[PDB]
Every structure is written in structure tokens, then in C-alpha cells.
Design a binder for this molecule. Sequence first.
Ligand SMILES: Nc1ccn([C@@H]2O[C@H](COP(=O)(O)NP(=O)(O)OP(=O)(O)O)[C@@H](O)[C@H]2O)c(=O)n1
Ligand SMILES: [Mg+2]
Ligand SMILES: [Mg+2]
Ligand SMILES: [Zn+2]
Ligand SMILES: [Zn+2]
Ligand SMILES: [Zn+2]
Lengths: 426, 513, 417
Amino acid sequence: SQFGKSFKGRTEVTITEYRSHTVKDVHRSLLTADKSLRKSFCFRNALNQFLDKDLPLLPIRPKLESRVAVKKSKLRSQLSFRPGLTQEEAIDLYNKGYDGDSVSGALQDRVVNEPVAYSSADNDKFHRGLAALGYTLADRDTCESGFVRAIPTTPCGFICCGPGSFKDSLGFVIKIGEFWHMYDGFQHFVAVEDAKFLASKSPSFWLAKRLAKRLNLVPKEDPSVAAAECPCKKVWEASFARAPTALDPFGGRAFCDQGWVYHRDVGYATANHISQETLFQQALSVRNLGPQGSANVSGSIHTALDRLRAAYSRGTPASRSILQGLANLITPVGENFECDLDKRKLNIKALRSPERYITIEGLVVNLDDVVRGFYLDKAKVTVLSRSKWMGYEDLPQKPPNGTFYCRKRKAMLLISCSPGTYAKKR
Amino acid sequence: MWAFQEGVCKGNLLSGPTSMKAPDSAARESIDRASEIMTGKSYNAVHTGDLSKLPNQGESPLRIVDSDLYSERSCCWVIEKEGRVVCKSTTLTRGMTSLLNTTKCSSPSELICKVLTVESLSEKIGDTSVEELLSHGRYFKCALRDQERGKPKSRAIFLSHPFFRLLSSVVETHARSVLSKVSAVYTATASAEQRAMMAAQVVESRKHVLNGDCTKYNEAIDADTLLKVWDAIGMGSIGVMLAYMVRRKCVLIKDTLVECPGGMLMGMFNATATLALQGTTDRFLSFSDDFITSFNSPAELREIEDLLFASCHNLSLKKSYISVASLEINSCTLTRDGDLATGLGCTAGVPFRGPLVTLKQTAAMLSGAVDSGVMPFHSAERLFQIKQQECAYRYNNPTYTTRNEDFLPTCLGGKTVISFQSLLTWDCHPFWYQVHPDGPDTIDQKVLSVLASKTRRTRLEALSDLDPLVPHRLLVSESDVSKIRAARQAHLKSLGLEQPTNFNYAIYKAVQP
Amino acid sequence: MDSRFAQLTGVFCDDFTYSEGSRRFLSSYSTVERRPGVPVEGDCYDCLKNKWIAFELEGQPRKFPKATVRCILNNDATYVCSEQEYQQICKVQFKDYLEIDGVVKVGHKASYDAELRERLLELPHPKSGPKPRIEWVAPPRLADISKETAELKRQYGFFECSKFLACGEECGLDQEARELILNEYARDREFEFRNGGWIQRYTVASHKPATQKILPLPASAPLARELLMLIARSTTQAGKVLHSDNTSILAVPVMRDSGKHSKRRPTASTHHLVVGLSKPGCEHDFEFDGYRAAVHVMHLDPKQSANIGEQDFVSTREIYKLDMLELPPISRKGDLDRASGLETRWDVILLLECLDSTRVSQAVAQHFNRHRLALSVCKDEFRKGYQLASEIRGTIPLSSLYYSLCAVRLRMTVHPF
RNA sequence: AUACCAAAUUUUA
RNA sequence: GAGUAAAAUUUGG
RNA sequence: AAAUCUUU
Ligand SMILES: Nc1ccn([C@@H]2O[C@H](COP(=O)(O)NP(=O)(O)OP(=O)(O)O)[C@@H](O)[C@H]2O)c(=O)n1
Ligand SMILES: [Mg+2]
Ligand SMILES: [Mg+2]
Ligand SMILES: [Zn+2]
Ligand SMILES: [Zn+2]
Ligand SMILES: [Zn+2]
């Protein structure tokens, strides 16, 4: 009869209310922690029990061993993207008797950021409390190592490590007409999205799972799916250029308009895809490859696209290409967004604002500066004082971003939007 | 010693102040400051900035996130028994359930739709009306918040009515949405360090940086300004009702109801107050009372001052300052080039709270410090060793430990003084896995939680182990709960399983490859 | 999926069964009729035909798979559905007048909106207030901090002895002598003895603050850690003398004196009088059996004792030392003294901060951080940020603020920035 | 115009 | 007695 | 009695 007491007068309540009412209350101790632990030797008894019973049952965790060289760097946000369980996986685990609430809790993609001031040669991600020592999350076939690298050391004559055709282990997903063809080398399947699922003959296919994750759709099995023209074989036997770039958070790389290559043994990118030194190269890679959904923009995607269009209306072809690349980088694939900055309507309110700003992965870019050739042609030099500060280096001939002392004008300068930091043609 | 640091140091090494003072004095002082601001003598509470450019949200569907309306944090519940108003402190879950019981409504969204749909303030929505709801939602209870470093006099905080919380959730959600759509650089969800980095990037084209703060922030945000912003973004009658309750708010101090016609009672609407300034200009990077705007000339400084005055963002002359070699926001100080400012920064000490919790918290603090450039790693391991010795001095007595095995820490009778690096890279005896920052709960934490729980009637039937795809906004009755539990139990039995096996994403992902 | 149709779906599945008892139509909005572990593709599911049914209005498509049957409800008279059976089922079930309520929008204007708006207009409004004239000037100089410290010293002066701070040094008595002296001091003060413990009883209070003065600095505090640990231990072991390696204290509960039915044991809110020993040579000297020691007291509430006991002196000192400049020698009054100053006095200051439960030194430190980082500040207002004497009360917090200001002054004296 | 939950710990306003 | 809001970690569901 | 509307 407790239901009639907690919810007197109501016969039905939401699951949220019911669950929130079944949370066990906690009484905050008036004492200090030490006195509470000493009370009745409760901590002593807990320690005895833990050593006697629980400690033997604790599994042994693996020791971390892989290390890389690291150097002092600007303060950055290391983005860790931990995918959650997919819908079918959670359904099967629930049907297998695993706790439904815990399984649901793992159902959501997690994105977190860590403040770290240490960079590796390969822009690797680091463990907690060990960035200064260079302990990496990545763990050391040559082909797999070359796939995840922007600039492979040893090309192997195939798309994975350079220009060429498709190796055996590489699959690819491409969009033809209104269907998504996934070809792996042995099996070829076709997929479509009815309303919110991704209908395919066999959703269990690894390429099908990757495509569903890239499109953020629940995999579904629909035998009555098939396309008319499937030139996949030709493109599988054709050769394509390899954009020199790190793998996007989805673990794949773009090789053509709405087409991405995937490697079986590469789960997800273990290096930061978008950084200060590689943002504009990545934007130029996908100039005309359509939306990618590879870079997270701070704020609203629609507002960012409006600013991008407003800057796109005024500018030279190079700036227009860079802006279109940025729009493709930030626009999710398949969502109701108009990334193409040629059919998108020009927003007057965006033009009202004097400066145009977009934040991509913690990098603040002024689109007006991009239009006037700053991040790629000339740096922005602002004088900070006419006196020399102690502990600051002299201004180089092609300074990167940072604070320097210029003897030619005996002044402290803050260099930003440097082509030596964003373009870095080397 | 904090005065002789070569770099920046907030002075966080010791704990914050404690106070057993009653909350009456601080609450009365805050109300008096609000009244003085209202009379128009010290600070501005009249908003004159232009908000006509804010996008209108009035056509968006009305959605309520029920998860925001339930929690263990306290709230004020009002009862009219014999013509008198009695305000009692309860939990937000209990207050929300009482509100939904008073007016027969299954979900908060149904309640808000019913309230918006009535045709008379006297019309009944159960055992209440919109008039009674507005009357009751203006009452607040005062409490004291202490343990804030740098504040010897603890601040006054206010517990609100569930109806006020319900309307506030909607208005604040939409204000955050408009901030995301309108801000020059979105920072309503960034961390302090992320805000500092974005600010450093933003102000790198100007010479002078105004490290700014506002004084009496919540007292100078008037109901008129809130209503102005809400009308600009299109909150309809919800904004009108909320502003009406704000203007007529009363606070229960001791045993007296004190009217507070001015202010917004200490951060009730952070997003709306932020929009009050962000909706009039794009020259600031700010959330609540903290902005990092920059300027080049004295004329630009005067324009910034005028904008701040017009937005009701009174500059704090005590704390605001100008810098050229650094920039600070959210207590995070960076150099103009973006590097973290050398020094301890916000590094805090770890008070003794148990043999193993102290070591775990010290390890977490040192890992955070070494991830940044605050201190090198050898300094961190030396500090961890010294902390282990201090813990051994404090705790190695018969009232806590009786063991002597080597692998235990010296504070529990062992002789192991682990290295920080060895602990971090899981290169320790399994007993040390709890001391790792990312490890499981320590023995002290489990003992403390058990002690808190074992402090007391009747419970509702457990509604655990649901289908991970069922939305939580669906309705359930007692019979429905029993039937769902029975069906799940039958399914588990058919699988030959007792209570479901706990699922850990980490272990499952380890078995997957 | 929309809750708007939930109730409507309940009408569609009205006690219809198949396979002689099993329910035919299962509503996606029902927590009992839902099939666990099956993704939802429509408003309801027909098990007999193994199909999905979703209800829509004219020209109002819903996001469902194409396979789901659309049971369109034309506004005028009828419902059109591709399947004939479902059309018949709806025509039968919805015969009773039942309409789908419209979607409520955030900017909805209620019928009472104008009345409440007028009510608000009739209520008080703020006045504009004056715009401040801000002058940006250089940050305060050494003379300003000197003036602040001089004003504090002039207004409050100094105590003759260090009082409880002197307890940071050994009292020159062995454990037996220390215990005897503490117990005899408790007896001399007429503390009640009960259940093997000492209790301080009170009847009336003057309801006025105690005398506030600055504490002169002892030479050093070798026993800082021991003193803090003893304060921590005394939080509940009150009434009996507690011993460390080199010193000991006695925490006496302070309970009201009813006269016959008086509190016999402390509760969570009871205050403590912490009594410590130091070397003699002040007005607090106490003698017994040839043992002389200065017996000092400190009245704390439980929160203050908890805050003081938990501080880690050694780790705090090491963390500060990590990036610390050279510490100068200072005198008993925080004045630079190269000839006769002692650097160890800095330790004492640290201990004082641990003893100061209001931690005003934290506010001073934050303001000094701003001062060191600042290029220009507001005239006459930034300086008025070190004036924190109004925010604290007591000898300990007052001395802590005074010596924090002295530290700022010494830093600007010996290491100008 | 529009286009995970709770508790605990630390920090931030 | 201990509120509003943000970030991160763990525990539980 | 003291860091005094607290020691309830
Ligand atoms: N624990 C906290 C701290 C801050 N806040 C909000 O943040 C504002 C600025 O906090 P502050 O400490 O700066 N006081 P504020 O009145 O601005 O005056 P001050 O500059 O200190 O003179 C407050 O007013 C509140 O809205 C809160 O809700 N809870
Ligand atoms: Mg402030
Ligand atoms: Mg600031
Ligand atoms: Zn290859
Ligand atoms: Zn194909
Ligand atoms: Zn004395």
C-alpha cells in the first residue's frame, strides 16, 4: 500500500518519479571521517574482511608499458570519445539476463575533454596522470600502423598507405543515388534508412555497423532492400588518391564524395584527429567530399553554418574552398543540414555581426580573418608593449603563434593566425 | 608562503572556512543590499540594452526534462493549514511528488500544460489553482553555504518551491539554447580551463585584457530584466508567471517572512542573466559574473564600461583589473600565448579523511597537477611519498589496523611506500588498485556510505532492470510495476539466472576482441 | 513516438484478443503490453498480422518506418487506412467523441497573461542609479600595505604572550608532569568531574565579543603536526588528557549548568575548551609540585575543531616550498629583521593559518594574486580589498589577517615585482 | 523562427 | 541545515 | 568561561 502513500491521489506516475522515489536516502555524519572510521572499529573490521575475503577475488589489471616521447606544449583539451553500446547489442545483452539499467547506461556515446600540456610526435592520447611520462593509450601488421597515420613511412601500393587500389583487408562504404553500398572484398551489401533505422539485409556486417555509427541510426534487418546499379566492383578495382590526414573519430578516411574506407583491425582513432596544426589541412581534404561529421563545433551547428555562409558570400576562391571544407568537417552526415555553401540561403543576421567566429574542437577561428588570408598567408602581429620582457625569445623570421621580442622595433609582440602554425608547409 | 610564490597561487592548499553561524545575518544582508539597489543608490538594476535581435523560441514545443525535477538536494514546501503559511525543508523529489499529488497530474509536463490551458486563475487544477501556485512559489527558505575559500563570512543560499523549480527549468533550458544560437563563442557548457583557452584565443588580437568580475550580481538582476529577456526570446506566459513570482518573492528567516522585491536570490537564473549581457553585444566572453573582454584604446574601454552598465553587469572595482601579459577567467590564468601560467594555480591540499581516501585524493590531485605543467613528475612522486609518511604517522595505530603484511601501506601496518608512477601504471599489489584515482571505491568510502545508509519504514516495489529502450516518461501503476517485475523474473528463470549479473562496460569490451 | 497519441492508442486496443486469449494489439505506450527487448516502429503492434500501426493527422507525417501502416485520421468525418480491417476497427472504436489535443508551445499565451502583466506593472520598479566614474591607476605600492598593517596595529595592538600559538613549542615537562599540570589546572578552575572526565559548566554569558589583539610570533613551531593531530583526536575524547610524543592537551566539553538535571554527556553541537601547555613566562603561568607551565585555552565549536584537526602541515609546507622564493628573517611582529630575525617564524605563521578557521589568509592570498597579475586597477577600490578586518572576529583570525598582510608587505619589500 | 539517471569526491561561478 | 549552474572521476541502478 | 544570540 506504499504506492497509495507516496503518490496519494494518483494511480499512475512516470518511471522517472518512481525510480527517484526508490533511491536510498543517506544521512550525513556529524563527526569527522576519522572518528566515523574509528567508531566500533568499523574500519578495522572492514580492512580485516577485505584482506580475508575480497582481496583474493580481485582480478589483476594489466600494467601499462607503452611510452612515447613528449614535450612541453600549450594547454590543450585532449578529447576522448568512448562509443557506447549499439541498440542491437544492448537488446541482446538484456535478453541474455544482464542488468537492464547498467546496459542502458552504456548505451550512450561519451565525449570528454582533459586539460593536458604535453604533445607527442604523433599527437597520441595519454593516460591519466602520465602525460608527462608519455604513456599512451595506443598500443604498437605494418599496414594497420600505416592506415592510422597521416603520412605513412612505408607505402604498400594500396589505398591504405598511399595512392592505389583496395587491399584485401580494406572495406569501403559509398553512397550511390539513395542507397549506401558497403563492399568488403568478399561480401557486398546495400543499406537504406527508413525513418530512424538503417535498413540492410544483414545489419551484423561490420561495414553496416560502421555506417550506422557514422549516420547515428539504429541498425535494422530488412530483406526487401536492393539497388539497381552497383558500380562498386569498378571502384573497388580502381585507384584513388589518399588524403594525408589522421583518421576521423569514426575510424575511417574519405576517398571520394560520400565514400569512406575502413580497416578491420582499426576500431577507433587513437590520436586526436583535429588539432591546431592540422585543422586547415583536414578542411582542404574534404573540400568537395560532402558532410563528414568529424569535428565537433561549439554552440549550434546551424549558427556555425550561417556564419560560414556569410563569410562565403565575400571572399576569393581559396577562402571559399577553405570555408566549404570547414562546413563539410562540422556538418553531420545525412542529417537535415545544408552544408553546401551554394544552395544554403544567405542569412542577413549573420552578416549583421561585425566579426564571424566559429569554435571547432576548442580552436577559435575568425572567419573574417580567413577571408582576408590570415591563417594561411600572413600572421597577425599585435604589439603588447614597447619594453623587453624577461624570459621571452627573439622573434624568428617566420614566427609561429606565441609571444616574442622584436629588436627591429624593440617591442613585445603576440603573433597569432601564423601560417607557420596553421599551414606549416613542411 | 603563498605571498612568496614565484608564480600564480590562489592559496587553495588549506581547506575552506567553516561556520556554525545561523543563516539569518547573511540572508538579511543580501536582502538589504537588494533593497538598496532597488531604491537606486549604489548599483544599477535597470536594463537599457537592446534585446530585439534575440531569436524567438515561442514556436518551439514545450518539453520538460523530468530528470531535472528530481534529486536529493533540498527544496522548500509550503503548506497553508489555518490561514498561515508554513515553509518546511524537504528533498526535491518529495516536494515535486507533493506538488504532483496536490494537483492531479501524472507528469510535470502535463502539469505545465494544464496550468497554461486554464481559463481563470481561480480555476481548480486539483486541490489548488494557478493563483495558489503563484502565491506559494514565491516563498524561499534561507540556508548557509560555507567551505568556500576566500570568504570568511559564508554566503546565503535559498531553497525554492517545486513549482518555481519547474518553471525555472523550462526558462533556463531555452535561455541556454538561445545562448548557443547567439553567443560569439559558446561557453555555457565549457569547463573553466576550456573557457580560459577559448578566451586566450579570442583576445589575442588586442593589446589590453580586462580581467573582469561583477559585484552584487544576483541582487542587481531585477525581475524586469528577466522578463525583458524572456519576452525577447519568447517564453510567453511562463516568463510572465516566473517574473511575477520573482518580484513577489519572500524569504523565511528564522520565523519571519521578509519581502525581497529586488534581485533573483543568488544564481536562480544564470543563463538568463548571462543572456542579459550576451544579447546586447558580442564583445564579451562570459558566463554569469565573469568576463574576459579585451580592448585596444581608452575609448574602447569606455564603450565596454557603458555596455556593462547598460546590461546591469556592474563592474566589480575591487576585483576587476587590466593585464597585458596574462588573462584570467574562472580562476584559470593563462599567458597570452595560451600556455598555462607557471605556479600552483588552483592546486589544493588534501585534508586527512581516512587512511586510503586521503591517498586516493592526493593521487588524483597530483595526477591533475602533472597532466598540466604545474609541477614535474619527480616533485609529484616525492610529494606522494611524503603524504604516505604523514598518513603512516596519523593512522598506524591499533584502532585502525592490526596487520603486518609487507604489501600493505605503512599506515596500515605494512612496509610498502609505493611510487606514484608505479601506482598510476597499475604496477602494484591488487590492494593498491583502490588508491588509484580511477580505481574502485576504497574501504573507507564503503564504510562511510554503509554508516550513512544504516541510519533510519516501508519501500516501494523495486522497478529495476528495465528494457534499455523503454523511455522513462511512460506511466506505471502499482499493478504495472508488479507485472513488469514478474515478467522479468520469469524471463530470468527461463535463462536459469538469479538476480541479474552486473554488467561492466570495461570488462565486456575487454572480452569483445 | 508521441505521448499525445498514447491515450488514443489505448482506445484502439480495446480488449481485442487472438489465439484464444492472447492480446492482439500491444500499445507502445504501455509499460505492461510492450514486448521487452523489441525496438518500437509504430504506435502499436498487431501480433496476429505481425505489423505496426501508427496514427497520423492530415498532412502531418510522423517519423516511422514505411512498413508501419498509417491510419490517417481525416479531420472532416472519417479515417482512411490502407488496410480495411484497421479502418473498420477505428470506425468502431473512435465512434465516441475523442480528439487529439494540440501541441502546447513554449511561447503559449494564457488567458490570465494580461492580468498578471498588469499586476507586475503595478508593483515596484527599480530606479536607474548612478553610473560610476572609473579611474584606472597603478596597483597599490608598499606604502599602502604598510598603512593597512599600521592601522590594524594601532586599532588593536598586541598581546604580551603568544597564547595558544606558544603551544607549538615544547613546554619543558615530561608526560607525567604534563598530565599532572593539566589535571591540576582543570581542578583549580573548578571544572566539574564526572565519569572520569572534566566538564566546564556555564550559566550566563555577557553576549559580547572577547578582546581582540594580535598574537606575537613564537620563534618556531616544531610541534605543529603533533598539535593539530591532538586537536583532531580531542574532537570526541573530551574530558581526559591526551598525549603525543612531546606535548599534550585537554579538551573540556562546555555544557550548560541546570543545577540538578544538567547535561551529563556532550552532543554533536557542544563546544570544547582546548587547553594546552607552553613554556612559562607570561600571565597564564601555572605551578604545581615544582612544575611550571603556561596553560593556554581556546574555545572552539565542533566544526572549527574538525576543520583545524584535518589540515596537513607537512604536505602544505612542502607544496609551498616547491616554487617558493627565499624567506626572510622576521621578528615577533612580522617585521623584517636581518640582524635578529628568525626564518623558522614562517612555520609559525603557517600554523596560525591552520588554527584560523575563517581562513582570511585565503582572501588575502587571492587579492594578492590579483595584485601581482594586474597592470591597472580601479582607483581607491582595489586598495580597499585588503581591508578585511570587518569580515572577521577573534584573536586568531585577526592575527592571521595581520600576518598575511605582513607577508604581503615583506614580499614587496625583499622581492619586488 | 525552427531544425543517459542518481549518489559520492575535486574544482569552477 | 546546507540551494542554482558547469566540468571531470568513481559506485550503483 | 570564550574565536560570545552559540556552547539547547
Ligand atoms: N556558491 C556560489 C557562488 C556563486 N554563485 C553565483 O555567482 C555569483 C557571483 O558570485 P560572487 O561570489 O562573486 N558574489 P557577488 O554577489 O558577485 O559579489 P562579489 O563579486 O563577491 O563582491 C553569485 O551572486 C551567484 O549568482 C552561486 O550561485 N553559488
Ligand atoms: Mg563577483
Ligand atoms: Mg574574472
Ligand atoms: Zn597498406
Ligand atoms: Zn555496391
Ligand atoms: Zn600566556
